Structures are given as C-alpha cells and as structure tokens.
C-alpha cells in the first residue's frame, strides 16, 4: 500500500514516456496513416 | 482503513502538466454492414482485423485497413452480448444470454469457419469474455461468478467468487497474470488467474459498473458506471483517483477504453455519442459525436493507431 | 491488384448472402415470454407444433413466430431487458389462480408494470394471457377475490371477476396511445389459444407498417 | 402569374431534394417502401426541370424532343409510382402475412425499372413525332402527325393520356383504400384513426383537384366536335386553359413528399437528426 503521490508519480512518468510515440494526442502524417 | 495512504490528491499532482487541449478526431471510415443492433466488439492484436457482434445472429470481422468483412459467422443464439480476439488471432469468442461461450476456428479448411467448442456451466448470462492466450479464457456471467475456462477440455479450471452482483465486464493486464471485473454492485475486485483470491477490493462508484478497462502499464485501471462519473483505481493504493465527472453530463458509462500512451481515456457514454476525457486532468478533452442512436463498444488498438467505437445504430466507426 | 480484389470479393460473398439471411427475421415474429414464477411460458408450448433461453419455432397460417422465454434467467432484467428492445410484440402469461398463493399477483403487476412501461418498449405491444381459467372458477367459489384487492371485484361472480382483473392490467400503463394491449382467456385447446397470438400479431404487422407506408 | 413559377420551385425543389438527402444518410433503404418515393423523387423533378424551359426562358430539334420527353417520361413515371404505393399500401394491410415475404427490396427495384421502361415506351411516340414549327422560339415543339394517320395519332394519344391519367390510378385508389379502411377501424385506437382515416381521403381528393382540371380541360380540347369545335369562341379562352392546368399539375409534383412523406410518424424523426 504506497502512497497516492508515488502511485500518482508513476502514472505521470508513464505518460510522459510513451506520449511521443501516442497517435491520438499527436497526429500522425496521412500517409503514414492506414487510415 | 487505508486513508492513512491519501496523501495527496492526483489532480494536485497533475496540475502543473499542460492539458492535452481541444483535440479534434474525425471518423476516416464507417462500417455498415450490420442489420441489427451492435452490442460486442473487439481489436485484434495486429491493429488489422477487428470482431463485432450484432443482434441478426452475424458475427462479423471487419478488416479495419481494407473496410471488408473477412468472415461472418452465423451464431446459433441471435442474442449476444459479448465477444473477444484471441491474441493468437485464430479464435474468436462470443457471448450472449444462452449462456453459452461458442468459440469459433477462423484457421480451417477452405475458408470454412466451425466451432471450436461449445462451453457451458454459467447459470447466468454471459456478460464478458476475454481470451488470456489461445488455450484459455476468462468469461464474466450474469450469475454474481466469473470463470477461467481452458478449450480443449472445456471444464470450470479456475472460479471467481465473491461478487455480491453480477459482472458486467471485465479487462485482462497486458501482464495477464492479473485481471479486474466490475459488478453491479459498485464494486471491483481483483482476481489472480492462477490463484483465482481477492487481493483487494475496488469500490465507490454509486450505481451498477459496466466498464472496465486496464491501463497500459497495468498498475492501475478505470471503471464506468452509470452514476455518470468514471473512477480510475491504482492496484498499489487501492483507493479513489481522479473520478471523472461532469455537471452537463448525467447519464450513464456503458464503455471505457484506454489509449496506448494511456494520457487521455476514451468513455463511452448513452447519450448518442461517445466522449474523451483526459486521464490525468479530469478534463473534457475532445468530443466526438456522429453515431445515430447510443454507443455501447469502444476499443484501442494495441499500438493505438486508432480507435474503434461501436453503436446501436448498425453503425461501426473508426477515429483517429 | 490481385489480393486485394480477391478480399473484396470474397467479402462481397458475405456482404449478399446476409441480404436474405437479415431478411428472413422479418419474415420471422419475435415474441417475448414473461412471467412473475413458473406460470410463464408454459400454455403456448404445450402446443405439439414445430440453455438460458429457449425458443420455440412454429408456422401458423404461413407466418415464421419465434417465441422467447426468460423464465430461466434469475438475474437482474435491468441489465437484459434492452437486448430484446425492438421484438415483434410481447406475450405475457399470468395465472388468474395466483392470488390466494403468497401475493403473487401483486408480483405479477410488478413484473408487468416494469416491462409495459420500460422505455425500449415503447413501440412493441403486449398480448398478456389471463391463463388457469379453468380453476378460476372453482378457486373464486372456494375464497372471495377480495383476499387479493380490497376493491371487490364486483360481487364475487365469475362473469365479472375476470372481467375486472383483465381491466387492472390494462390501466397499469400510461402510454395507452401509443400501443395497444391485447387480452385473451386462454381455453382447453392449443388451436384456439395459437389463433389469437396470430390475430394480435397480424394487428401489429398492421400498426408497424403503417409508419413505413406514412399512414401514421 | 409569373410569381407562380418561383412558388413551385421556392419549397418543391429543395423539398424533393430533402427527401433524398434524408433516405441515403439515415434511412439506408432499409424498407423497401423506401425506393418506391426515391424514383418517385426522380420523377417529379423530371417533370419539374420541364417548367422553366416551357416558358420559352433561354438547337432546333433534338433539344426539344428531349424536352417534350423529359415531360412525358417525367409524368408517367411519377404518375405509375403512386399506383405502386397504393398497391404496396393494399398489400401491407389486407394481407399482412402475405406482404411480409413480398415486401423485399430484389422484388422492388425489379418492379420499379419495368415501371421506368414502360413510361419511356409509353412516351415514345411523343418523340417521334415532336417536331419544331419556329425555330426563332427555339422552345415551341409540337406533336405533328401525317395527314393519313392524323386521326389515329391524335385519338390515340389522347386516348391514352386519360385511362392512364385519372380512370387507372382512381380505380386503384378506391379498390385499394376500401380495403385499406376495411382493414384499418378494428385499430381498437379512436384517437389515432380519426388522424388516419382523415389523411388517406385528403391522398384521394387532391389527385382529383389537381390532375382532373387537366383532364377535364383535355377531352373538350382533343375531342372539338362536342363543344370546342362548335362554338369556336372559347378556344382563345381555352388557349391559356392548358398552361393554368399544367402548373396546376406541376403543384402536385412538389406536394407529393409532404403527402407521401413527411405525413409518417417516424419521418420526422429523421428530420431533426439530420438537421442536427
């Protein structure tokens, strides 16, 4: 049982980590889009 | 008992991050090829091919690149409720109020779809299924139980017990070794597959659960109810993080899926479109609308190249 | 362009033989079975004509009917019931026995009361049959209906006790206007209870295709 | 009078068109009652496209006989679909069981191109004979026939504008609705077939206020020896009869959506999705 703050702590980190390689908050090219 | 653990609130952890702003997401594709109404669907695990499940006694996979149907498989029960992928790819799952788990083997003789085997021992209706590996399967029912179930054998290896009210549905880790159920009991609980206990108990939402989903690291997950909030819970404190809810919005949550970077949720809700809720922020970021009636599936691809949204108007769409 | 026109091919396969298998539910009657206990469901089937739901198949007067039972389902119908929204019509089985016994004809209205003014049925009528009318009789003469309602019905005569009952179930709804409630005293005879299942579903036919022919 | 013109085009043309942009999006055809009014939206702009090239607004004679057959075609076409939806109205009440296998969408775009083909051959002999008398007007075509087979041409033309005009359709709208409403006052419901019965007699009485002055005004016209020919002084008033009656049986094209259409309880439910 952590605390809020380092469970919070690892929620953030995580987002921030994967939110270059994210194609819904940053579009992507339509080309390099299947879609 | 543990409110010793509420340091802080995330939501003051979290406010010195920059919002994700007013994102815009339109639909690149619709599919309309379903006659009654849409009430399962899933992604496959190459982002290609998805499963949808409609009330005409169809179950149809859509290739989502190419907007065709690789197969379509005729249900014996016309009323079904839940489907699942295997992550393998070569069985697909569906449920319904027969309470019967009918597996189907895409791989077959000339392109011939059969069924794999036919399971059975819920007494309530099916509700979920969810497909752990391509030997077994966890199937949420409507008789307060859920089960572990393993396909050549079809016998009940593994039950979850504890739930005071039927399960609605349930989520699976990208770990698998742990996966969460929410009942109409405005609870959830967490089950190990290999040990089938209760770990710790996650509650708090004020009407019936009927969506949960993971998120992408797999130390927390996200709940939505019909109390028109949706609750987000850590495993590690096992408390209430970052409930999102709105004074415009007063209906219910029927699906909640995460993205791959698991920054913004997607929610969907009964109010003839679905919604995008930011998961650090608790901010409306981005509403997307377009479904003739209700939206009652929604579902992320594994790399997050889009995301999939599923009404009651026979109508598949396709955001990015 | 070869794989790529073999996949759209192939899917326009699946895309034509759906035509017709979608169009055979319409042809097809879907009908609903309720009940308050073990009375559901039991009076139609009994009819020698051809887990968690069973369906029965039968053609009457060269019409499909396709009929529903959920008796076998204990959980809550507030999860279920909008999987059956949009059937054809919904017969109700309520034993006219059933109110000497603990009460279960004030189960029964909570049962029907739910299910006629649910709001995914709206448009879908229901053909409620007043079943163990043959006892009835017998059972009124025993006991006074009164035991059941304080309102008498009438003067504890046969001719007007059921006449009351089937009124107290066709005042329980509202929306009074916008479907219709059919009522029949099922008898001794599979030919004569199956004959007004088909008269009430006809009516229905009727009523639905007039908002598609723009009558109503 | 001029006025007259913009009215019809003011709400009947965008209106037909509403009609058609509502079915592809929201409707979907699934009904097969659904096409039946499409083509029929086809049609009445068919004849609606005529309207302002009649009026000599600005190609000698091929640009007319097209004309003169985008009104024929246009009329027939728009006149036989509202006897198909009679008749789909007789078959979805009368017999409910028998309907529910014939109401299917490969018997009606089937039964809706036989329907298309049969106006164009009904209307041919229109445009074979339509030629230009002034080429200076560039939109005065008119039917010219041999002095042999003038008689012929001319009785049988006209023979077969009227039994396909009022006598064939009205004979289908009274065997029909009797039926209809044989089949529609068990309805157990007053206050919603006070609504119907209402409507489906205004459907009848309309078609003999609009298309009947056509034809009462035609059989005098063709048929002189009655009264035209003897008295010879009201064929100047007559002169115009015929375009008062023929924008009198242009208003019918563009009512037809909001009698056959937007009268069903559903229709504007769509209506406010797609307005959105």
């Keep these: 049982r952590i605390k809020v703050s380092k469970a919070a702590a690892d929620l953030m980190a995580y987002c921030e980590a994967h939110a270059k390689e994210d194609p819904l908050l940053t579009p992507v090219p339509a080309s390099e889009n299947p879609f | 008992a543990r409110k010793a653990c509420a340091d802080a609130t995330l939501s003051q952890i979290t406010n010195n991050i920059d919002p994700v702003g007013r994102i815009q997401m339109r639909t690149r594709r619709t599919l309309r090829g379903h006659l009654a109404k849409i009430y399962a669907m899933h992604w496959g695990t190459d982002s290609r091919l998805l499963v949808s499940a409609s009330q005409d006694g169809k179950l149809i996979i859509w290739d989502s690149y190419t907007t065709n149907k690789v197969h379509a498989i005729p249900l014996r029960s016309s009323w079904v409720m839940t489907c699942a992928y295997a992550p393998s790819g070569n069985y697909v799952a569906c449920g319904g109020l027969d309470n019967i788990c009918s597996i189907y083997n895409l791989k077959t003789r000339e392109g011939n779809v059969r069924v794999s085997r036919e399971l059975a021992g819920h007494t309530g209706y099916l509700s979920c299924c969810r497909f752990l590996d391509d030997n077994q399967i966890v199937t949420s029912s409507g008789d307060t139980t859920c089960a572990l179930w393993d396909i050549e054998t079809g016998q009940q290896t593994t039950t979850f017990t504890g739930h005071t009210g039927d399960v609605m549905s349930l989520s699976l880790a990208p770990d698998t070794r742990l996966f969460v159920s929410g009942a109409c009991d405005a609870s959830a609980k967490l089950w190990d597959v290999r040990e089938g206990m209760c770990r710790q108990t996650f509650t708090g939402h004020e009407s019936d659960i009927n969506a949960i989903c993971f998120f992408p690291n797999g130390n927390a997950f996200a709940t939505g109810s019909d109390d028109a909030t949706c609750r987000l819970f850590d495993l590690r404190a096992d408390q209430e993080l970052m409930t999102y809810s709105h004074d415009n919005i007063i209906c219910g949550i029927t699906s909640v899926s995460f993205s791959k970077s698991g920054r913004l949720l997607l929610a969907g809700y009964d109010d003839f479109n679905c919604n995008v809720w930011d998961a650090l922020k608790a901010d409306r970021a981005g509403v997307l609308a377009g479904h003739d009636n209700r939206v009652s599936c929604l579902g992320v691809t594994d790399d997050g190249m889009a995301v999939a949204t599923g009404s009651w108007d026979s109508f598949l769409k396709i955001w990015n | 362009s070869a794989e790529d026109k073999a996949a759209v091919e192939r899917s326009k396969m699946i895309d034509r033989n759906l035509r017709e298998d979608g169009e055979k539910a319409a042809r097809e009657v879907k009908l609903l079975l309720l009940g308050a206990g073990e009375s559901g469901k039991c009076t139609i089937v009994k009819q020698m004509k051809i887990t968690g739901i069973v369906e029965t198949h039968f053609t009457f007067k060269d019409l499909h009917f396709k009929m529903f039972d959920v008796t076998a389902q204990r959980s809550e119908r507030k999860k279920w019931i909008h999987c059956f929204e949009g059937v054809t019509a919904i017969i109700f089985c309520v034993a006219l026995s059933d109110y000497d016994l603990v009460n279960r004809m004030h189960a029964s209205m909570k049962l029907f009361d739910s299910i006629c003014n649910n709001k995914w049925f709206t448009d879908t009528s229901i053909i409620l049959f007043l079943n163990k009318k043959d006892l009835f009789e017998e059972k009124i003469k025993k006991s006074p209906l009164t035991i059941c309602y304080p309102e008498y019905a009438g003067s504890n005569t046969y001719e007007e006790a059921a006449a009351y009952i089937q009124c107290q179930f066709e005042d329980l709804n509202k929306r009074k206007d916008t479907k219709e409630i059919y009522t029949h005293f099922t008898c001794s005879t599979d030919t004569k209870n199956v004959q007004f299942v088909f008269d009430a579903v006809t009516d229905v036919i009727i009523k639905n295709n007039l908002k598609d022919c723009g009558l109503f | ?276």
Aim: charged content about 10%; some cysteine; proline content about 3%.
């Design chain 4, 1 to 276: 009078l001029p006025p007259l013109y913009s009215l019809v085009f003011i709400f009947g043309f965008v209106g037909n068109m509403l009609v058609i942009l509502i079915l592809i999006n929201c409707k979907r055809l699934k009904s097969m009652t659904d096409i039946y009014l499409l083509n029929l939206a086809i049609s009445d702009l068919f004849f609606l496209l005529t309207v302002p090239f009649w009026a000599h607004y600005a190609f000698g004679n091929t640009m007319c006989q097209l004309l003169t057959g985008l009104y024929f075609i246009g009329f027939f076409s728009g006149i036989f679909f509202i006897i198909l939806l009679t008749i789909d109205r007789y078959l979805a009440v009368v017999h409910a069981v028998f309907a529910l296998k014939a109401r299917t969408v490969t018997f009606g775009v089937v039964t809706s191109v036989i329907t298309w083909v049969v106006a164009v051959f009904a209307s041919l002999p229109n445009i074979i004979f339509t030629r230009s008398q002034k080429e200076g007007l560039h939109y005065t075509c008119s039917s010219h026939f041999p002095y042999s087979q003038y008689q012929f041409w001319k009785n049988f033309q006209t023979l077969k504008i009227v039994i396909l005009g009022l006598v064939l359709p009205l004979l289908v709208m009274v065997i029909c609705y009797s039926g209809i409403l044989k089949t529609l006052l068990r309805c157990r419901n007053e206050k919603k077939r006070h609504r119907a019965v209402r409507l489906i007699f205004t459907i009848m009485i309309v078609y003999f206020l609009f298309w009947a002055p056509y034809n009462i005004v035609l059989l005098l016209n063709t048929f002189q020896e009655f009264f035209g020919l003897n008295n010879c002084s009201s064929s100047n008033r007559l002169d115009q009869a015929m375009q008062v009656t023929e924008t009198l049986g242009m208003t019918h094209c563009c009512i037809n959506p909001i009698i056959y259409a937007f009268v069903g309880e559903k229709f504007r439910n769509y209506l406010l999705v797609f307005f959105q």
